Amino acid sequence: ETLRVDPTNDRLSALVEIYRMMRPGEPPTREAAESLFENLFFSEDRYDLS
Amino acid sequence: GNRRIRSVGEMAENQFRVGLVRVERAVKERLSLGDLDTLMPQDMINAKPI
Amino acid sequence: KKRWYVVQAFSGFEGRVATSLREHIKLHNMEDLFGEVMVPTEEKFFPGYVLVQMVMNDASWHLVRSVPRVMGFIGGTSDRPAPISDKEVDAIMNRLQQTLFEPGEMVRVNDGPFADFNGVVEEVDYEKSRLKVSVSIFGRATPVELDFSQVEK
DNA sequence: CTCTGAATCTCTTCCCGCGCGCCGTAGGAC
DNA sequence: GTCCTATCGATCTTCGGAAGAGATTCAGAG
């Protein structure tokens, strides 16, 4: 059912949609969508489970 | 079983971490642009944020 | 062809903005993408706006915003910041290359121990490039002479 | 192709006094 | 030291409100 609602296609599409909804007014870029996604939940500077 | 107690030795630690994060933010740029030769570690950091 | 682009910058930190861009261009070895960065100043035309000779690549678009004290460029849309103009650059370069104390007027002083006091012009020290303005000291409001730099009109 | 449904958006609102007590422009250039 | 200018013009301002009301969009709906 989520697949039926999904308007995105693949990893590039995923990063574009994530960047657009996360940062309105900021253009997506392949090298920068990673800088956002990794910092979201995988980068120590902005994620740390005690 | 889902709520835990933070005490002085943890909140103070977090505040110190915030201060150190600000200090790192400043001194990373200072070291990137500094000549690294005449600089001494006292020059790199200033106590004021912490 | 490297069109000029206008960037917002921390007022008072504008020179540091230009320098921080100059370092980052070389460090990221994008020297082939930036021609010059202008901060015009008189004895400052643009109070808080930095002109950068640049091309439009996404790497450069993020590079400029990766310089400290830089929000970004000023343009129609954030996806594509716009250059200024053909003649606008020429006019800015043209400028970058290129009052009498009336007797009786009530003035304020600009410096000294008597700085910013309610004085009134009393006479004309004109050909001296000087001044003399009455002020209200110890009841004997004294005939008091000032430098020409001490006017506030 | 819009109309006249819902559905999903932002905004407004939340008792009365009374006392303690602190705490209250900032960084940068000459 | 004084006095200045400017105010995330490279962050992330908090996630432990509820509701109630409109206002604004959409969606089969003919």
Side-chain angles (χ1 to χ4, degrees), chain C residues 63-110:
Chain C
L63 172 66
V64 176
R65 289 167 65 96
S66 69
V67 166
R69 316 168 199 279
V70 166
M71 179 190 300
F73 326 90
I74 306 304
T77 177
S78 62
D79 301 323
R80 295 171 174 266
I84 25 190
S85 286
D86 180 21
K87 55 181 179 180
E88 279 187 330
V89 183
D90 316 335
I92 295 183
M93 294 169 56
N94 171 35
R95 279 194 296 277
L96 193 55
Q97 182 178 0
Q98 177 184 22
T99 61
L100 64 161
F101 54 109
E102 317 174 28
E105 123 83 348
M106 330 85 63
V107 315
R108 284 165 164 262
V109 199
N110 194 26

Short mmCIF file of all heavy atoms in Angstrom, two decimals, chain C residues 63-110:
data_model
loop_
_atom_site.label_atom_id
_atom_site.label_comp_id
_atom_site.label_asym_id
_atom_site.label_seq_id
_atom_site.Cartn_x
_atom_site.Cartn_y
_atom_site.Cartn_z
N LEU C 63 29.83 25.73 -3.10
CA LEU C 63 31.11 26.21 -2.61
C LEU C 63 30.97 27.59 -1.98
O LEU C 63 31.50 27.85 -0.89
CB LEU C 63 32.14 26.25 -3.73
CG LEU C 63 33.46 26.93 -3.35
CD1 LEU C 63 34.20 26.12 -2.30
CD2 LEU C 63 34.35 27.15 -4.57
N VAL C 64 30.24 28.49 -2.64
CA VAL C 64 30.07 29.83 -2.10
C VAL C 64 29.33 29.77 -0.77
O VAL C 64 29.71 30.43 0.20
CB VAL C 64 29.35 30.74 -3.11
CG1 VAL C 64 29.08 32.10 -2.49
CG2 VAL C 64 30.19 30.88 -4.35
N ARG C 65 28.27 28.96 -0.69
CA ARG C 65 27.56 28.79 0.57
C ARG C 65 28.35 27.97 1.57
O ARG C 65 27.92 27.86 2.73
CB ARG C 65 26.19 28.16 0.32
CG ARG C 65 25.20 29.10 -0.36
CD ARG C 65 23.98 28.35 -0.87
NE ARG C 65 23.18 27.78 0.21
CZ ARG C 65 22.12 28.36 0.75
NH1 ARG C 65 21.69 29.54 0.33
NH2 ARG C 65 21.46 27.74 1.72
N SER C 66 29.47 27.38 1.17
CA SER C 66 30.36 26.69 2.10
C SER C 66 31.42 27.63 2.68
O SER C 66 32.22 27.19 3.50
CB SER C 66 31.03 25.50 1.43
OG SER C 66 31.97 25.94 0.45
N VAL C 67 31.44 28.88 2.25
CA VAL C 67 32.30 29.90 2.83
C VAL C 67 31.59 30.45 4.06
O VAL C 67 30.36 30.63 4.03
CB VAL C 67 32.61 31.00 1.79
CG1 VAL C 67 33.22 32.23 2.45
CG2 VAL C 67 33.55 30.45 0.72
N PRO C 68 32.29 30.70 5.16
CA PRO C 68 31.62 31.24 6.35
C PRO C 68 31.05 32.62 6.10
O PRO C 68 31.52 33.36 5.23
CB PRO C 68 32.74 31.28 7.40
CG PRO C 68 34.00 31.32 6.60
CD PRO C 68 33.73 30.47 5.39
N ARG C 69 30.02 32.96 6.87
CA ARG C 69 29.37 34.27 6.81
C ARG C 69 28.78 34.54 5.43
O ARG C 69 28.85 35.65 4.91
CB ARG C 69 30.35 35.38 7.22
CG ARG C 69 31.18 35.03 8.44
CD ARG C 69 32.32 36.00 8.65
NE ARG C 69 33.35 35.43 9.52
CZ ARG C 69 33.28 35.41 10.85
NH1 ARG C 69 32.23 35.90 11.49
NH2 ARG C 69 34.28 34.87 11.54
N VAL C 70 28.18 33.51 4.85
CA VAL C 70 27.57 33.58 3.52
C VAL C 70 26.27 32.79 3.56
O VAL C 70 26.29 31.56 3.65
CB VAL C 70 28.50 33.02 2.42
CG1 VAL C 70 27.72 32.79 1.14
CG2 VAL C 70 29.66 33.97 2.18
N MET C 71 25.14 33.50 3.51
CA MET C 71 23.86 32.81 3.32
C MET C 71 23.76 32.25 1.91
O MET C 71 23.42 31.08 1.72
CB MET C 71 22.70 33.75 3.60
CG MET C 71 21.33 33.11 3.40
SD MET C 71 19.97 34.29 3.45
CE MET C 71 20.15 34.96 5.10
N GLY C 72 24.05 33.07 0.92
CA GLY C 72 23.92 32.67 -0.46
C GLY C 72 23.78 33.90 -1.35
O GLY C 72 23.92 35.03 -0.89
N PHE C 73 23.47 33.63 -2.61
CA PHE C 73 23.37 34.69 -3.60
C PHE C 73 21.99 35.34 -3.56
O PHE C 73 21.06 34.84 -2.93
CB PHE C 73 23.66 34.15 -4.99
CG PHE C 73 24.68 33.05 -5.03
CD1 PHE C 73 24.30 31.72 -4.91
CD2 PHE C 73 26.02 33.34 -5.21
CE1 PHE C 73 25.24 30.71 -4.95
CE2 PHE C 73 26.96 32.33 -5.25
CZ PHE C 73 26.57 31.02 -5.12
N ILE C 74 21.88 36.47 -4.24
CA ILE C 74 20.62 37.17 -4.42
C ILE C 74 20.21 37.01 -5.88
O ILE C 74 20.91 37.48 -6.78
CB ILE C 74 20.72 38.65 -4.03
CG1 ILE C 74 21.28 38.78 -2.62
CG2 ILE C 74 19.36 39.32 -4.12
CD1 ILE C 74 20.47 38.03 -1.60
N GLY C 75 19.07 36.36 -6.11
CA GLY C 75 18.61 36.12 -7.46
C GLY C 75 17.13 35.79 -7.45
O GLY C 75 16.48 35.78 -6.40
N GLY C 76 16.61 35.52 -8.65
CA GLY C 76 15.19 35.25 -8.77
C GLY C 76 14.76 34.00 -8.03
O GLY C 76 13.74 33.99 -7.33
N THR C 77 15.53 32.92 -8.17
CA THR C 77 15.24 31.67 -7.49
C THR C 77 16.52 31.09 -6.91
O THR C 77 17.61 31.32 -7.43
CB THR C 77 14.58 30.65 -8.43
OG1 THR C 77 14.37 29.42 -7.72
CG2 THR C 77 15.45 30.39 -9.64
N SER C 78 16.37 30.34 -5.82
CA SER C 78 17.52 29.74 -5.16
C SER C 78 18.16 28.64 -5.99
O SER C 78 19.35 28.37 -5.83
CB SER C 78 17.12 29.19 -3.79
OG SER C 78 16.14 28.16 -3.93
N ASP C 79 17.39 28.00 -6.87
CA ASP C 79 17.96 26.99 -7.76
C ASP C 79 18.97 27.61 -8.72
O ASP C 79 20.01 27.01 -9.00
CB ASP C 79 16.84 26.28 -8.53
CG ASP C 79 15.84 25.60 -7.61
OD1 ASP C 79 16.26 25.06 -6.57
OD2 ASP C 79 14.64 25.60 -7.94
N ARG C 80 18.67 28.80 -9.22
CA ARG C 80 19.55 29.50 -10.16
C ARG C 80 19.66 30.96 -9.76
O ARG C 80 18.80 31.78 -10.12
CB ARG C 80 19.03 29.37 -11.59
CG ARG C 80 19.04 27.95 -12.13
CD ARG C 80 18.31 27.87 -13.46
NE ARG C 80 18.42 26.54 -14.06
CZ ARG C 80 19.34 26.19 -14.94
NH1 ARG C 80 20.26 27.05 -15.36
NH2 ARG C 80 19.35 24.95 -15.42
N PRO C 81 20.69 31.32 -9.00
CA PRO C 81 20.96 32.74 -8.76
C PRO C 81 21.37 33.42 -10.06
O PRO C 81 21.99 32.82 -10.94
CB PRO C 81 22.11 32.73 -7.75
CG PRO C 81 22.78 31.43 -7.98
CD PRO C 81 21.69 30.46 -8.35
N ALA C 82 21.01 34.69 -10.17
CA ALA C 82 21.20 35.35 -11.45
C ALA C 82 22.37 36.33 -11.40
O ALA C 82 22.69 36.87 -10.34
CB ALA C 82 19.93 36.10 -11.86
N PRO C 83 23.02 36.57 -12.53
CA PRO C 83 24.04 37.62 -12.58
C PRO C 83 23.42 39.00 -12.43
O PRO C 83 22.21 39.11 -12.24
CB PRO C 83 24.67 37.43 -13.97
CG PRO C 83 23.60 36.78 -14.77
CD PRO C 83 22.89 35.87 -13.82
N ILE C 84 24.22 40.06 -12.52
CA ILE C 84 23.66 41.39 -12.33
C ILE C 84 23.18 41.95 -13.66
O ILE C 84 21.98 42.10 -13.88
CB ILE C 84 24.67 42.34 -11.67
CG1 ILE C 84 26.10 41.88 -11.95
CG2 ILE C 84 24.41 42.45 -10.18
CD1 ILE C 84 27.14 42.62 -11.13
N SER C 85 24.12 42.23 -14.56
CA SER C 85 23.82 42.75 -15.90
C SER C 85 25.13 42.94 -16.63
O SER C 85 26.22 42.77 -16.07
CB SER C 85 23.04 44.07 -15.87
OG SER C 85 21.69 43.87 -15.49
N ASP C 86 25.02 43.30 -17.91
CA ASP C 86 26.19 43.73 -18.66
C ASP C 86 26.65 45.11 -18.20
O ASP C 86 27.80 45.29 -17.80
CB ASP C 86 25.87 43.75 -20.16
CG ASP C 86 27.04 44.20 -21.01
OD1 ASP C 86 28.20 44.12 -20.54
OD2 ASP C 86 26.80 44.64 -22.16
N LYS C 87 25.75 46.09 -18.24
CA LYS C 87 26.12 47.47 -17.93
C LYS C 87 26.27 47.69 -16.43
O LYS C 87 26.93 48.65 -16.02
CB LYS C 87 25.10 48.44 -18.51
CG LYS C 87 23.67 48.17 -18.07
CD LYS C 87 22.71 49.16 -18.71
CE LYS C 87 21.28 48.88 -18.31
NZ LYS C 87 20.33 49.84 -18.94
N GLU C 88 25.65 46.86 -15.59
CA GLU C 88 25.76 47.06 -14.15
C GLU C 88 27.19 46.85 -13.68
O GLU C 88 27.71 47.63 -12.87
CB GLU C 88 24.79 46.15 -13.41
CG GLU C 88 23.38 46.69 -13.37
CD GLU C 88 22.44 45.89 -12.50
OE1 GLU C 88 22.66 44.67 -12.36
OE2 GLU C 88 21.49 46.47 -11.94
N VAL C 89 27.86 45.81 -14.19
CA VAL C 89 29.26 45.60 -13.85
C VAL C 89 30.09 46.79 -14.29
O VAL C 89 30.97 47.26 -13.57
CB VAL C 89 29.78 44.30 -14.51
CG1 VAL C 89 31.21 44.03 -14.09
CG2 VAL C 89 28.89 43.12 -14.16
N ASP C 90 29.82 47.29 -15.50
CA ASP C 90 30.58 48.41 -16.03
C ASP C 90 30.38 49.66 -15.18
O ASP C 90 31.33 50.41 -14.94
CB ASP C 90 30.19 48.66 -17.48
CG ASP C 90 30.08 47.38 -18.29
OD1 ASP C 90 30.73 46.38 -17.92
OD2 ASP C 90 29.34 47.36 -19.29
N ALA C 91 29.15 49.91 -14.74
CA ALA C 91 28.87 51.07 -13.89
C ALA C 91 29.58 50.95 -12.55
O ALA C 91 30.15 51.93 -12.05
CB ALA C 91 27.37 51.23 -13.69
N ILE C 92 29.54 49.76 -11.94
CA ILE C 92 30.20 49.58 -10.66
C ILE C 92 31.70 49.78 -10.80
O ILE C 92 32.33 50.42 -9.96
CB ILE C 92 29.85 48.20 -10.07
CG1 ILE C 92 28.35 48.12 -9.75
CG2 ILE C 92 30.66 47.93 -8.82
CD1 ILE C 92 27.93 46.83 -9.11
N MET C 93 32.29 49.24 -11.88
CA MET C 93 33.70 49.47 -12.13
C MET C 93 33.99 50.94 -12.44
O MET C 93 35.05 51.46 -12.07
CB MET C 93 34.18 48.59 -13.29
CG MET C 93 34.15 47.10 -12.99
SD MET C 93 34.42 46.10 -14.46
CE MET C 93 35.99 46.76 -15.03
N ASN C 94 33.05 51.63 -13.09
CA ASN C 94 33.23 53.04 -13.37
C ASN C 94 33.33 53.83 -12.08
O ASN C 94 34.22 54.68 -11.93
CB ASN C 94 32.08 53.55 -14.24
CG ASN C 94 32.09 55.06 -14.39
OD1 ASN C 94 33.14 55.68 -14.45
ND2 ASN C 94 30.90 55.65 -14.45
N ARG C 95 32.44 53.56 -11.14
CA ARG C 95 32.51 54.26 -9.86
C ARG C 95 33.73 53.82 -9.06
O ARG C 95 34.37 54.64 -8.39
CB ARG C 95 31.23 54.04 -9.06
CG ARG C 95 30.10 54.95 -9.50
CD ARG C 95 28.96 54.95 -8.50
NE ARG C 95 28.33 53.64 -8.37
CZ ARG C 95 27.40 53.18 -9.19
NH1 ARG C 95 26.96 53.90 -10.21
NH2 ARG C 95 26.89 51.97 -8.97
N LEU C 96 34.08 52.54 -9.12
CA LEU C 96 35.24 52.03 -8.40
C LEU C 96 36.54 52.61 -8.94
O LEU C 96 37.55 52.62 -8.22
CB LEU C 96 35.27 50.50 -8.48
CG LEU C 96 36.21 49.72 -7.57
CD1 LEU C 96 35.98 50.10 -6.11
CD2 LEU C 96 36.00 48.24 -7.77
N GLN C 97 36.55 53.08 -10.18
CA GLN C 97 37.72 53.72 -10.77
C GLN C 97 37.70 55.23 -10.59
O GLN C 97 38.75 55.84 -10.36
CB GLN C 97 37.80 53.37 -12.26
CG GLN C 97 39.00 53.94 -12.99
CD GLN C 97 39.05 53.53 -14.45
OE1 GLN C 97 38.18 52.80 -14.94
NE2 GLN C 97 40.07 53.99 -15.16
N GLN C 98 36.52 55.84 -10.68
CA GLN C 98 36.36 57.29 -10.61
C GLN C 98 36.40 57.79 -9.17
O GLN C 98 37.47 58.02 -8.61
CB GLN C 98 35.04 57.68 -11.28
CG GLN C 98 34.69 59.16 -11.23
CD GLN C 98 33.33 59.45 -11.83
OE1 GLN C 98 32.47 58.56 -11.91
NE2 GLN C 98 33.12 60.69 -12.25
N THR C 99 27.69 72.14 2.89
CA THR C 99 28.98 71.76 3.44
C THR C 99 29.67 72.95 4.09
O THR C 99 30.77 72.83 4.63
CB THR C 99 29.92 71.18 2.36
OG1 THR C 99 30.16 72.16 1.35
CG2 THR C 99 29.29 69.94 1.72
N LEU C 100 29.02 74.11 4.04
CA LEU C 100 29.55 75.33 4.63
C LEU C 100 28.81 75.63 5.93
O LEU C 100 27.57 75.64 5.96
CB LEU C 100 29.43 76.51 3.66
CG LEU C 100 28.07 77.04 3.19
CD1 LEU C 100 28.22 78.45 2.63
CD2 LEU C 100 27.44 76.13 2.15
N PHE C 101 29.57 75.86 6.99
CA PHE C 101 28.98 76.17 8.29
C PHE C 101 28.42 77.59 8.28
O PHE C 101 29.15 78.57 8.46
CB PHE C 101 30.01 75.98 9.42
CG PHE C 101 31.30 76.73 9.22
CD1 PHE C 101 31.60 77.83 10.00
CD2 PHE C 101 32.23 76.32 8.27
CE1 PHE C 101 32.79 78.52 9.83
CE2 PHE C 101 33.42 77.00 8.10
CZ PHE C 101 33.70 78.10 8.88
N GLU C 102 27.12 77.70 8.03
CA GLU C 102 26.49 79.00 7.93
C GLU C 102 26.48 79.69 9.29
O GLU C 102 26.15 79.05 10.30
CB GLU C 102 25.07 78.86 7.40
CG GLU C 102 24.95 77.87 6.25
CD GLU C 102 23.51 77.63 5.82
OE1 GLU C 102 22.67 78.54 6.01
OE2 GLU C 102 23.22 76.53 5.31
N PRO C 103 26.87 80.96 9.37
CA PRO C 103 26.80 81.67 10.65
C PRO C 103 25.38 81.68 11.21
O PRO C 103 24.40 81.86 10.47
CB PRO C 103 27.27 83.08 10.30
CG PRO C 103 28.11 82.90 9.08
CD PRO C 103 27.48 81.78 8.31
N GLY C 104 25.27 81.47 12.52
CA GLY C 104 23.99 81.39 13.19
C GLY C 104 23.40 80.00 13.29
O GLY C 104 22.49 79.79 14.09
N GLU C 105 23.90 79.05 12.50
CA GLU C 105 23.39 77.68 12.57
C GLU C 105 23.78 77.03 13.89
O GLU C 105 24.87 77.24 14.42
CB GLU C 105 23.92 76.89 11.37
CG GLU C 105 24.70 75.61 11.69
CD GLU C 105 23.82 74.41 11.96
OE1 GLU C 105 22.59 74.60 12.12
OE2 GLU C 105 24.35 73.28 12.01
N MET C 106 22.85 76.25 14.44
CA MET C 106 23.06 75.53 15.69
C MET C 106 23.67 74.17 15.39
O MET C 106 23.07 73.35 14.69
CB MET C 106 21.74 75.36 16.44
CG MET C 106 20.74 76.44 16.22
SD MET C 106 19.75 76.13 14.72
CE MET C 106 18.93 74.56 15.26
N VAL C 107 24.86 73.93 15.93
CA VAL C 107 25.61 72.72 15.62
C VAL C 107 25.79 71.80 16.83
O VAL C 107 25.50 72.17 17.97
CB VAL C 107 26.99 73.06 15.03
CG1 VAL C 107 26.87 74.14 13.98
CG2 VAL C 107 27.96 73.49 16.12
N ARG C 108 26.31 70.61 16.56
CA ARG C 108 26.83 69.72 17.58
C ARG C 108 28.24 69.33 17.18
O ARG C 108 28.59 69.29 16.00
CB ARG C 108 25.94 68.47 17.76
CG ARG C 108 24.65 68.74 18.52
CD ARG C 108 23.65 67.61 18.35
NE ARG C 108 22.59 67.67 19.34
CZ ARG C 108 22.57 66.96 20.46
NH1 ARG C 108 23.53 66.10 20.76
NH2 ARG C 108 21.55 67.11 21.30
N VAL C 109 29.06 69.07 18.19
CA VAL C 109 30.47 68.80 17.97
C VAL C 109 30.67 67.31 17.71
O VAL C 109 29.84 66.48 18.08
CB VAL C 109 31.32 69.29 19.17
CG1 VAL C 109 32.78 69.46 18.77
CG2 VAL C 109 30.77 70.61 19.71
N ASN C 110 31.78 66.98 17.06
CA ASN C 110 32.04 65.62 16.62
C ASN C 110 33.06 64.87 17.46
O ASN C 110 33.03 63.64 17.48
CB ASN C 110 32.50 65.61 15.16
CG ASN C 110 32.46 64.23 14.53
OD1 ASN C 110 31.69 63.37 14.96
ND2 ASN C 110 33.29 64.01 13.52
#
